[PDB]
Amino acid sequence: AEEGALVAAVEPGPLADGAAVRLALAGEGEACPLLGSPGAG
Amino acid sequence: TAMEVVKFVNFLLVNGFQTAIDIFEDRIRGIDIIKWMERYLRDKTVMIIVAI
Numbered sequence: 001a002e003e004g005a006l007v008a009a010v011e012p013g014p015l016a017d018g019a020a021v022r023l024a025l026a027g028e029g030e031a032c033p034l035l036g037s038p039g040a041g
Numbered sequence: 042t043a044m045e046v047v048k049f050v051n052f053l054l055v056n057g058f059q060t061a062i063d064i065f066e067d068r069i070r071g072i073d074i075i076k077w078m079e080r081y082l083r084d085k086t087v088m089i090i091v092a093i
Contacts, residue, residue, distance in 0.1 A: 040052060040055055040056050041052070
């Protein structure tokens with residue numbers, strides 16, 4: 001009775017892919033601070 | 042400190058700060074020393090410089 005059953009191969013059907021999300025900072029700079037006062041005699 | 046204090050007071054006076062000290066306000070101080078001290082100790086706005 002060889003027709004009893006069959007072997008079956010399983011696959012994951014609905015696969016999906018996506019891209020990674022990376023953060024970045026736009027622009028850069030630095031304003032100078034102020035300091036100092038004169039000594040006296 | 043008095044010797045260097047004289048120079049320090051001169052330096053402050055050159056910079057226009059109104060400095061009160063016994064050696065230079067002697068006449069006003071001579072009237073009443075306790076009153077003279079309290080005049081500055083009472084006042085919150087008067088900075089006090091301590092010579093160490």
